[PDB]
Amino acid sequence: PKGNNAIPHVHQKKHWNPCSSQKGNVKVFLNQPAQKHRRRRLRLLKAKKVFPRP
Amino acid sequence: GVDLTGISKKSRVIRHHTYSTNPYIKLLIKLYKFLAKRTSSGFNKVVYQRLIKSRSNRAPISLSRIAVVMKRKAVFTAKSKAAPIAVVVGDVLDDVRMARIPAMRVCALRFSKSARQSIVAAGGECLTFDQLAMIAPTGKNTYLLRGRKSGRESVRHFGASGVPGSHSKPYATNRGKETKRGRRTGRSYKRKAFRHV
Amino acid sequence: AKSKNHTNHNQSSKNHRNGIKGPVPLHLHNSKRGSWLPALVNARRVRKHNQKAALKKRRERIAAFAAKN
Amino acid sequence: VHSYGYKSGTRHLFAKKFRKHGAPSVSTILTNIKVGDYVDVVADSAVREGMPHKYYHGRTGIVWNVTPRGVGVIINKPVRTRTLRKRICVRFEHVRKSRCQEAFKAKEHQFQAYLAAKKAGKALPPLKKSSRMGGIVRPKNVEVLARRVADYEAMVPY
Amino acid sequence: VNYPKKKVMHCGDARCNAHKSFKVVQYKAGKARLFARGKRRYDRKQSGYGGQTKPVFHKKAKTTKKIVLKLQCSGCKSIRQVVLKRTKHFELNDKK
RNA sequence: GUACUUCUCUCGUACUGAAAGGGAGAUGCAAUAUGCAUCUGUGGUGUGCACACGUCAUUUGCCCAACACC
RNA sequence: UCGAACCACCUAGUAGCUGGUUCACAUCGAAGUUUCCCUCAGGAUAGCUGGUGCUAGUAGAAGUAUUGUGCGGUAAAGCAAAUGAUUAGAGGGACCUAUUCUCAAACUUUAAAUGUGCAAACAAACCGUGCCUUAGCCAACUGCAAGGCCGGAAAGAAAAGAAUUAGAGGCACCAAGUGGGCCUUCUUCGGUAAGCGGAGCAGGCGAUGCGGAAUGAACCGCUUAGGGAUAUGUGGCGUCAAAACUUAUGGGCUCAUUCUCGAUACGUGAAAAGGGUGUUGGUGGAUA
RNA sequence: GGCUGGGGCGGCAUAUCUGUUACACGACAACGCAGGUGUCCUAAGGCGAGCUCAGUGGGAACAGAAAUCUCACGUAGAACACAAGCGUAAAAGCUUGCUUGAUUAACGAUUUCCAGUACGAAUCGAGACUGCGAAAGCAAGGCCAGCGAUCCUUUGCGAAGAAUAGGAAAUAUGAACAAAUCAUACCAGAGGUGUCAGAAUAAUUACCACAGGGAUAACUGGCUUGUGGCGGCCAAGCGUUCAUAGCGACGUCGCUUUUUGAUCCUUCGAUGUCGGCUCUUCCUAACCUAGCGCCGCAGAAGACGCUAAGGGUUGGAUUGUUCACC
RNA sequence: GAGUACGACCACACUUGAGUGAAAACACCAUAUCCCGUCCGAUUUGUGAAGUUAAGCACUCACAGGCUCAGUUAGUACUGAGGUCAGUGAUGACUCGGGAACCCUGAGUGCCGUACUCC
Secondary structure (H helix, E strand, C coil), X not given: CCCCCCCCCCCCCCCCCCCCCXXXXXXXXXXXXXXXXXXXXXXXXXXXXXXXXX | CCCCCCCCCCCCCCCCCCCCCCCCHHHHHHHHHHHXXXXXXXXXXXXXXXXXXXHHHCCCEECCHHHHHHHXXXXXXXXXXXXXXXXXXXXXXXXXXXXXXXXXXXXXXXXXHHHHHHHHCCCCCEXXXXXXXXXXXXXXXXXXXXXXXXXXXXXXXXXXXXXXXXXXXXXXXXXXXXXXXXXXXXXCCECCCCCXX | CCCCCCCCCCHHHHHCCXXXXXXXXXXXXXXXXXXXXXXXXXXXXXXXXXXXXXXHHHHHHHHHHHHHC | CCCCCCCCCCCCCCCCCCCCCCCCCHHHCCCCCCCCCEXXXXXXXXXXXXXXXXXXXXXXXXXXXXXXXXXXEEEEEECCXXXXXXXXXXXXXXXXXXXXXXXXXXXXXXXXXXXXXXXXXXXXXXXXXXXXXXCCCCCCCCCCCCCCXXXXXXXXXX | CEECCXXXXXXXXXXCCECXXXXXXXXXXXXXXXXXXXXXXXXXXXXXXXXXXXXXXXXXXXXXXXXXXXXXXXXXXXXXXXXXXXXXXXXXXCCC
């Protein structure tokens, strides 16, 4: 490879991109906050049912 | 056509303007672009030269670099006449390695919070460039400083590692990776540690 | 196809296009590591004693100044 | 040069002149070399070990290291865009103190000896003038240039 | 090449620390041992299916071998290994 | 989305050896197989902005950055 | 559909290979070479180039002189000098002696032109019964080596032809394209030669037109922001076709009947040996 | 595998050393020229001392061109392991004596090739113990070509003894501890890649395929003209005689592009690639036809030459033939 | 004016054939117990000093060979720069400049230090 740049070790060889051919092991967190508002809503409801137990 | 080999090779790059989007820097150059023009003083047009240099070329000096340096000048000055001002166009930082700094009246573009307290707590001032135009409009009896630019890790990587007599830090994320040929003397060879030039 | 060509043609025109930079001055790099050693040792054994004497002069010029005023 | 060896190009550069053959004379053993001194590197062929390379023969530089049988010299070798400053190690049989610096260091002495001579005069020798300036010429003999009939039969010998 | 059976060289130890007459013996030695780390690896790679997994060397250009001498210090006990040029016939032979 | 939060985590402040391991200031006195004292300080030398006191661009002072020799 | 069917999929298979790769203007501007590679249609690497720069705008300047001082074995010359070829007669069949004709990329005594190394006053050099320091040298010792210190002077480099400069020196980071070249004066090797093959020092085309040689990549002149004037270069002034409306009040020479006398260098892009009481000159000898 | 005046076969120009090409620094190409290398040497290494070599000439029983002795001359005309160059004469050669500097050499620097990387080889050093020499000094191989990465295998060095503690000084690891094995590590060497900066490698395709190439062959055309063809000049000789009626050797100067080469400029997303038949036209180096000169031209027939391309130039056997033969 | 010892440059010093050499040196020389070395006291090594300038050495000489320097060869050969120069070519002259070599002629035939010594 050309120049003084560092020796790239990126491990992307396995099929990951879901190319029209394949599926590919991609995990995306776009649902992070919606599950943040959900874990809270479910701590409150259990707090509302468990009452008055800590 | 007139013959001028080049003519593209005596010409050099200067860049009067600034590459900074900071609105305050654009005021400070407004001041010195004015008063490096009309002032007839060496100091006052160096800080205008220096005020447009992008962050890389303005390297912070620590405190205790200002102190040590200015304690070297303060010895041979007449005991009657003392008014040196540390004038720095970069950032001034706080040195944990030194305590008990005298009172130096430093001037700078920006002070480390711990660096500014560590001045005034020891009795000095900190005065930024809109003041210093009032105190030293000729730059008179200032003391101008720069930074320390040669210890950066970017300057350390420059140059090839495997060239003889070049001590340079190669790019690797895993340091234990590249030790093993052309570094060790045992197998293929060791790059010569020193080379006459 | 005969690929084995060799020419010097354009070279000294390129070598002078940034010019041939003249040598580095004598004073710039001395770095005597060559070198004939028993003379090199006896050079540092002095070059230490020139530091003491010169760093002493740094002190005698601190007193003599504050002495003057 | 077919083989690109160490001393590949030289049956002449390294040959001794006609009837100058011999081993190195005493006068070149009794010369002494101080560091910093300018020197010619001219390889003597009657001493095998210690020769400089084919390129350095005929160059001049500043001696720097001095070892019991050796010297070392700093010579300018122009390479692609730049002049590297090369350090070579030679047996001093191949080394002669250069006269290059000489006429200059003589111009410096003949200035100072000139200057101490004006200090309290004694006057000074007169300043020589140009030969290119004017004059009347008083010819003692004058001849004619012509192309002679006889000049042509001299140019067709035989 | 005729070479002496006994050579006075130097001995390096503080116990040697002078020229001592040695005993000359040629180095043709190594016997490859199982359980050497590289052999334990070549058996785990070689085992199973697949062909020869490691390159085997055929084209042989050289007719000689460098000659290593094991020289055993007589009064001091260490051995040294001295290397000599390439020769097709090497023989240890007294004075000729 | 913005606003808020920590012990931690991580890149740094220190590096070196295969490893077990070890691990950095200055000055003075001084030579003690961990010497002793002091702590407002560039380890030294050559070159080197600005500043300061001079002079007819430049002497000396300190020299920032930086280059080179130690 | 057969020297391995058909269908869907792995599959947008891989390609150092061919084709394509959409706005403008401005500032700059190349390379076909080096080294390594199962390398030769490709790459990495230095170079060329752009961008960002840093550094105290004459510093460590130079594709050039002059002076001083070094280096050299090509052109020439020599064989009456060595080595190697080599013709003839003479002198004392071979020999011996002195000559003689003729030669050399792998011969040489001698030896250019063009070149090449260094030096030519500010971190330097020069000077001193200066001083300090040494585990350097020596039979010395205040000699020589070295690092300094302190004084001295400094046409800041005279005179002698006795330099010049569109001479800001120096350092660095990042990166593209190129790594098929071709032509020419001169030198030059293989070939009978080549619009052939291969190099050296340079200049060009490549990438660039414009004026000129009718035409031509490279020749000649010239080097291009958009326009006007005056003047010119190479080349031209009978018409084509701007300029002698066919200039002079200039001297000679030339007649050529079917590829048709001759008339743009480079361009054998056409001619030789040999001939001629065609004509026009000259040199030598001779009779009058 | 590769380079390659297409590829193949051959070669080695693939790693390499001396002379030359090479153009008086250095650098410089070809499948340019003339040769080498993969080894060999305990002496052919190291050193001190003595000597002088190749050859020539005079003389000496056998004994001669040539044996051994002796004298004189002897600038190297000899020798130095080998290719070549260079260098050397009280030596660098020869003889002889004693020897192991052909070991170790703290990671010193530098040259050569060059990217100023490595390898190879080499130069200058500093330390140890030495060798020869009265000594100064000389020697870390035989000057300069004679050679080798990562990984893997393999051998050598890290003797014993001591330390109240890891230090100035004891080699480390097996990671919960400790022993003895075993394995590994750090240092220096060896086993080797000759395609020599280092893959593990046989064929055939006319049943063939693909990506491209006019970067590269098989046609034409272009340059060239050795070869083929055609002609001139000179005049030794032939022609009983007489160089030139007609020829014309030894030489020498050209032309043509109807031969074959040489080259590889155009065309490989395609210029239909032998011969005959048919048909037209052009060239002239003229076979017949027109006119003429000359002859070793008496006539007849013909030789040689000049102007001249308007006209003409056949029927068949065999052969695919062009060519060739009847 | 010389000699010897050490020498520097290394023929203006060498080579050949002659001639002459004061003193002191140098040497030839006489010898072989001792040290030492060989076939041979030739070389060499140790002892010494009867004899000779015969030889070496020093010097002079030769229409001598060589060698040194300068002439000449010759502004010829060659060569850097130039041409829309001549020539079919081969090559050549020209313009701004550098500029040789042998034969050939003449002239020269060592010089310079330290130390000790001879008239």
